[PDB]
Design a protein around this ligand. Structure first.
Ligand SMILES: CC(C)(COP(=O)(O)OP(=O)(O)OC[C@H]1O[C@@H](n2cnc3c(N)ncnc32)[C@H](O)[C@@H]1OP(=O)(O)O)[C@@H](O)C(=O)NCCC(=O)NCCSC(=O)C1=CCCC=C1
Ligand SMILES: CC(C)(COP(=O)(O)OP(=O)(O)OC[C@H]1O[C@@H](n2cnc3c(N)ncnc32)[C@H](O)[C@@H]1OP(=O)(O)O)[C@@H](O)C(=O)NCCC(=O)NCCSC(=O)C1=CCCC=C1
Ligand SMILES: CC(C)(COP(=O)(O)OP(=O)(O)OC[C@H]1O[C@@H](n2cnc3c(N)ncnc32)[C@H](O)[C@@H]1OP(=O)(O)O)[C@@H](O)C(=O)NCCC(=O)NCCSC(=O)C1=CCCC=C1
Ligand SMILES: CC(C)(COP(=O)(O)OP(=O)(O)OC[C@H]1O[C@@H](n2cnc3c(N)ncnc32)[C@H](O)[C@@H]1OP(=O)(O)O)[C@@H](O)C(=O)NCCC(=O)NCCSC(=O)C1=CCCC=C1
Ligand SMILES: Cc1cc2nc3c(=O)[nH]c(=O)nc-3n(C[C@H](O)[C@H](O)[C@H](O)COP(=O)(O)OP(=O)(O)OC[C@H]3O[C@@H](n4cnc5c(N)ncnc54)[C@H](O)[C@@H]3O)c2cc1C
Ligand SMILES: Cc1cc2nc3c(=O)[nH]c(=O)nc-3n(C[C@H](O)[C@H](O)[C@H](O)COP(=O)(O)OP(=O)(O)OC[C@H]3O[C@@H](n4cnc5c(N)ncnc54)[C@H](O)[C@@H]3O)c2cc1C
Ligand SMILES: Cc1cc2nc3c(=O)[nH]c(=O)nc-3n(C[C@H](O)[C@H](O)[C@H](O)COP(=O)(O)OP(=O)(O)OC[C@H]3O[C@@H](n4cnc5c(N)ncnc54)[C@H](O)[C@@H]3O)c2cc1C
Ligand SMILES: Cc1cc2nc3c(=O)[nH]c(=O)nc-3n(C[C@H](O)[C@H](O)[C@H](O)COP(=O)(O)OP(=O)(O)OC[C@H]3O[C@@H](n4cnc5c(N)ncnc54)[C@H](O)[C@@H]3O)c2cc1C
Lengths: 380, 380, 380, 380
């Protein structure tokens, strides 16, 4: 657990303050009415929190993965949707940060400098290509000084609102994991078409888009890296995304635990607070221990990523699986601890349980993350 | 597993047909728009399915608990809310059926004969008295030929719409489990006041009421049984309710499993249906086995109830805990099996997961049911 | 749950009596000193319990699978090793009963009539061929009126002591699942060689043999069924074996539960029996519920087998997985309930935990049984 | 995860070397023949490893709790019994180190300086007083310049061989948690009587003693701290013991995992190493993740102890519960991964499963540790 710099400590104190005073009171309505977290996005921009991994060279704060992880745990505590904003925003920029040419980085990252409110998105998933990302069908054909892109993407977080989308497509279908390339695609490009914004079980304070590319021309200079390196770029981006999912899950689990704990102190049955009942003590014990274990695995994984350590793949996969499992279990149980009240929309913990489910599925499902982990352990 | 009579087999074939053709297509909208299942209630009345435990002597079909259990499994498969209608309807009548005088039974059960569409409710729970039902505060004072009732109830299923409500109240607070009595209270009684219909995580195709009794007079002849027998009447009603909860949970789990199974056969990743993947096979195996185990425990418990066998308490408690746990786990996993699509409202399995949670809480939580089970095993 | 005949009820009362009075007092020593259960084998022969599935036509009692299952639950309660005797004995005869010609059945089953004490064994597993039984290397070559058998088997229960062993071997390696045949091999055949009797974690009141076949000649008329039908014969025998494993596991779990229950009533800490502590009540609840669920799944599977119902494969696989898992969990927890004393050899429950582990592995491991179950559900 | 000093790094490299080259080859025989680990005890003394928490002031290395934890993880990897030697040795000295007067510390700790091979033991548990330590019956009566001790202890690790035993007894039964005192008792004191060395499921390379005190006189100056402070001294010693149990459990789990991993790489079924099978990958993933999570919780708890941080109680309780649970699960599964071979004594992983069970029970059971954890979270 690296010593935090004073800059990190100040950032995290401010995040905890904003989470408590501004984010938490909004979260019920954000879910109830399925709202993009505009107020949060605007506030985060003003405070320097929207783009924490943007490099200093492009006007960013370049905080590192550990810092963003800690931020995600604080936000996930109170609003999983508001955390997801930060995950999608950082995700959409990471392919350019780590693959783009000097020229491309300057061209497209400058607009995110400072208090910019512009948004990113990452578009890899397709109806045909979820866990099997190599099955994606979107194609990019070189024609002169342009690529012509045809296909579709689904479940794209912020897709319909992103200024800049990183699209993965095949430039050579025959070469498989060596035939995918990655492209910067700007909002307003002719041929970019938005589909439905789908209705979800949870994390409803969000945008979940279908994209279509119909003879969509992008300049040749919008390619990220060389042709055929896009699958490795995607896999590297996912390695980091998984740690962000894990951090958000740690937060979700903690926020539900905190509400369970307070309920046990306040709710009297059989003549005393229910905290006095040994089975409630046992439930809270098991909940807190899994959150703490998940927190430690997640912080180790984030540190390994910042250090550029090969082991980050393994530990990030174990942190994603364990912290999401833990958020699913702990939230299920925190609803239980609140009894009837736990099932009521007004008390929040039902939303956190709906939110928790997504963390088992996105950034790759927990069956894929178990594959990645097992492969890394058995075929080192 | 008793041989089913031909009357039971015909009933269950008809229920399966109605569930498939009429109930299943309605369930998405029932949840989305938070609708009482009026069409179902009216159809069930016409078909003789609304009041299966009403005795023949009062114009009812007197099917028994095993039959209703099987019905609940079929309905829960497709619409947990529509099953809950039948649970609440039977629950609200069981205190009168098993405690009321000949005169009271005739007076209040006759109106449920035949194709009646009138509704019942059972009102025991209070803000102060959830697991600790002995902590209820509602009071009934004898004044002449009337009782004067003052207090409140919450989480009452169908409360605001029931023609007949069974209210539990203290007639002698000092005598504890011997000082509660039970009362028939009619819709339209001066002093009966409805509160909010609360918004729930799931089973939203339902009514969940707060009741208030403000100097509410009921005739002395509306008491169910003698003064002070109401706690035993309540405990007996819960013994049976628990088996109905278990049956509904079995159905929920089965309906989610069925959608998972079909998805594995249709969804191709890595070049074949995902059914070909051994981890998916393992998930479905574990899901199906827990549903089947829960189904068997539930059918044994229902049979013991019909037989009047003392062991029904023990087995019903084990069936409630195990079938609700199983619905929570199996639905959580069926969402998982559908991946991203599983999280989308349009595909149903997210609702079944929200519905499943309630089965762990109502009719007594799974911590209370474990207490009941453990007590029965250790202090036989 | 079929009504038991009076013959089955008498048999099971006698088994319960023998288990309690004769088997239970011997079990500690049987494990401690790694003893074949000779006294049990001899007593079972005298009482008509050694060979319950031997057909009447060959002097046997022809009890059926349900009866043997119930017997296995009673024996497993007190001595898993003594149950295993009955499993191995029946297993070794089932290939002949269900595959052998009239002539072969008369030739080799007659010697098991009545109070015979002769033993059987089933020899399929090899070092190269455990879960992958198609990888077996043992070969049988037709030479005139004989087959010449060369290879080896391991983990063969009773192998070195069986009068009659059913050996599976390839008669045509190129035909795979159609190139295995099955053979009766008699104790005393030149070329049959015994290896080590290996030392096990549990079920130590048993014999676990390595067999070698060195140019071992058997008469051509010792083949069971036609050449190449041996893999189907083996798979059918395993379908039934799995239900016997499940029954034994149910017994193991029950016997450990019973000792836990009694300990909670007798062991006083904090001034009362520990049965008074809600967490102990919860543990015992969860234990009893999983035993009961496993018991019901096992009895359904056995009935389907007796009825010749295709669904027996599916249900037997679910019963084996669930009842063995349950024995592993329940015994682990029954040791826990006894605290320090639970870890001591003198109190029995540590042996039942060591015994329980085997039930997850033999008759095919719980990963294979999950494959079988999942395949049956997804590819019906 | 504090940076390790170069002294800690050298110590741990040496421990890993000794564990691998000297401890691991001995462990099978140590269990098989129930041997005290004399060779290890003597080697550890020579290398400065027997008494790592002995203060420098008394000739000790004063390594701290973190160092001993890391040592325990290395030893537990290969021999749980040899780790337990170090746990018992440190435990028996900690009451004197942290409670004894200057005079008492010099009098009794000097003999453990340097390469001493003398042993300690901690004697609190009684037949009447396991989880309920306040129920202990042993009494110490002041008579002049002596205390007269009468009672008994059981499950005392190294009890019959310890030169110095710390005995807890009531000096004032009426004062409860303020009426227990702690005493140094020397081997050879008239009135100290040894009972049986009991036979255990696992950790059989150990001594597990019953002690009796029959009018046993000890000098008044052998009291540890003032009269009535012994319960707090005991509770503080247990807080630290729990972290040592957790560390040993982490090691047990790791050692079983390592053998599972190697087996998957070497064991071929279905034509490839079983590592290729996705279900095996999943099992190993879940195993490794729980070991890593337990490792992190344990290292955090040990650091908090070294830092004198109040939170050590909470984290040590969560580490003990989680690391022991994990050793029980991971070893159960590592036996599974080795299939039939996993059940055989020669392959080691069955012993580690038997060893693992104890870690759930000793230093306080996992039901008590859950109570401690839950209390700390709900009543901070
Ligand atoms: C693991 C997988 C199934 C690929 O496995 P397969 O069995 O098919 O393929 P394979 O044979 O193992 O590998 C092929 C080649 O890849 C290479 N390579 C591998 N790893 C590499 C690495 N780390 N780095 C570099 N390269 C790596 C290999 O070395 C190999 O190349 P080779 O033959 O030349 O050596 C992959 O498609 C996957 O991750 N799917 C999960 C879907 C998912 O994560 N979706 C999340 C979407 S976003 C989200 O949800 C959001 C949410 C919130 C808001 C923001 C977003
Ligand atoms: C178990 C409980 C905590 C009582 O335990 P406690 O520790 O406080 O009390 P105790 O000391 O054990 O017993 C006191 C006396 O009771 C008697 N007695 C006991 N059992 C009896 C029996 N079976 N039969 C007869 N009598 C029985 C005892 O013998 C004893 O009397 P004694 O001293 O003279 O001998 C109880 O309040 C409970 O069940 N709460 C759960 C709440 C719940 O279920 N709410 C569901 C609401 S509806 C719902 O949710 C819906 C959903 C869907 C739509 C429709 C509805
Ligand atoms: C499942 C298995 C892995 C075969 O799967 P694979 O993926 O390799 O092969 P596959 O492709 O699925 O099938 C090949 C062919 O088989 C046929 N067929 C399949 N099922 C059939 C059925 N039910 N009936 C008839 N036929 C059945 C198929 O239809 C197919 O033929 P096809 O292509 O012409 O259509 C198999 O080797 C197995 O069970 N291993 C577990 C080891 C085990 O149980 N050992 C226990 C040892 S004893 C013990 O431990 C003791 C303890 C106590 C004391 C006493 C003993
Ligand atoms: C938790 C327990 C049940 C006491 O709970 P109860 O509900 O009965 O009592 P309570 O009411 O909570 O507390 C009473 C008073 O205690 C005080 N106090 C509490 N904690 C304190 C602290 N940390 N520090 C200081 N003081 C602490 C309280 O503040 C309170 O005082 P107050 O009223 O004046 O304020 C206790 O007996 C226990 O730990 N049993 C487990 C047995 C066990 O661990 N055995 C392991 C044996 S060794 C082993 O196995 C080996 C293996 C390997 C080789 C080497 C060895
Ligand atoms: C709200 C939301 C936001 C998302 N945001 C992003 C985004 O911004 N950008 C983006 O590109 N994508 C995004 N994702 C997509 C997401 O990563 C995927 O849904 C996920 O990879 C699963 O793919 P799928 O939904 O096609 O499920 P499938 O791959 O069809 O999985 C179905 C089931 O099969 C199992 N399965 C599949 N393969 C295997 C295997 N080899 N072994 C064992 N089991 C397996 C899965 O675990 C699952 O249980 C998001 C999804 C959602 C729902
Ligand atoms: C939608 C809905 C419909 C319902 N329908 C009916 C109805 O029609 N009529 C009716 O009367 N009631 C109804 N119930 C009420 C229901 O049975 C209760 O909510 C349930 O008993 C729990 O009570 P509570 O919500 O007060 O939770 P609490 O009793 O406050 O429980 C809080 C937590 O403490 C735990 N806890 C409490 N006591 C113990 C104990 N002794 N040991 C261990 N843990 C314990 C609980 O398990 C829970 O985890 C319904 C509730 C809901 C939400
Ligand atoms: C005491 C004892 C008695 C026995 N009695 C009999 C007897 O009388 N006669 C007889 O013929 N045999 C007997 N068996 C053998 C027994 O059935 C096998 O050990 C069992 O099939 C496993 O084979 P294996 O030990 O080779 O393990 P492996 O097949 O090597 O398994 C190693 C691991 O790989 C996993 N694995 C293997 N294949 C797959 C797959 N396709 N998918 C997922 N995971 C998989 C397994 O589940 C296990 O976890 C007995 C074994 C024992 C130990
Ligand atoms: C091999 C071995 C070595 C040991 N070494 C030491 C040693 O060197 N010195 C020493 O003093 N002691 C030693 N211990 C003792 C050990 O700590 C105890 O056995 C342990 O505290 C449990 O006590 P018990 O065995 O009396 O079980 P009990 O306290 O009788 O427990 C029985 C069951 O009740 C449960 N239970 C008890 N109280 C509660 C509660 N309040 N809430 C919920 N559940 C509860 C327990 O968890 C357990 O499941 C050792 C024990 C063993 C077996």
């Amino acid at each position: 657990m690296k010593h935090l710099t004073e800059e990190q400590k100040l950032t995290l104190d401010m995040v905890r303050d904003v989470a408590t005073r501004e984010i938490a009171p909004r979260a019920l309505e954000l879910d109830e009415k399925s709202l993009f977290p505009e107020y949060a996005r605007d506030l985060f921009a003003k405070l320097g929190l929207l783009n924490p991994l943007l490099p200093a060279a492009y006007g960013g704060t370049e905080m590192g993965v550990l810092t963003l992880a800690l931020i995600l745990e604080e936000l996930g505590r109170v609003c999983a949707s508001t955390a997801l904003l930060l995950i999608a925003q950082t995700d959409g920029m990471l392919p350019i940060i780590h693959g783009g040419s000097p020229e491309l980085k300057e061209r497209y990252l400058r607009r995110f400098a400072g208090e910019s409110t512009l948004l990113t998105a990452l578009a890899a998933t397709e109806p045909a290509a979820g866990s099997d990302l190599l099955a994606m069908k979107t194609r990019a054909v070189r024609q002169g000084d342009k690529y012509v892109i045809n296909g579709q993407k689904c479940f794209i977080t912020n897709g319909s609102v992103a200024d800049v989308i990183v699209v993965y497509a095949y430039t050579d279908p025959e070469k498989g994991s060596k035939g995918i390339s990655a492209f910067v695609v700007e909002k307003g490009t002719p041929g970019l078409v938005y589909g439905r914004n789908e209705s979800k079980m949870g994390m409803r304070g969000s945008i979940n888009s279908e994209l279509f590319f119909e003879n969509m021309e992008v300049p040749a200079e919008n390619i990220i890296g060389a042709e055929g390196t896009g699958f490795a770029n995607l896999m590297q981006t996912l390695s980091t995304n998984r740690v962000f999912c894990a951090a958000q899950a740690v937060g979700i689990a903690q926020g539900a635990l905190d509400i369970a704990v307070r309920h046990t102190q306040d709710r009297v049955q059989f003549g005393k607070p229910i905290a006095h009942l040994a089975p409630v003590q046992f439930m809270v014990a098991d909940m807190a221990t899994a959150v703490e274990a998940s927190r430690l695995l997640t912080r180790k994984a984030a540190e390994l990523l910042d250090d550029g350590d090969k082991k980050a793949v393994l530990y990030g996969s174990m942190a994603k699986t364990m912290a999401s499992d833990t958020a699913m279990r702990v939230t299920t149980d925190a609803v239980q601890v609140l009894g009837g009240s736990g099932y009521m929309k007004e008390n929040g913990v039902e939303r956190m349980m709906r939110d928790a489910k997504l963390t088992q599925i996105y950034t790759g499902t927990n069956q894929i993350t178990r594959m990645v982990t097992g492969r890394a352990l058995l075929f080192p």
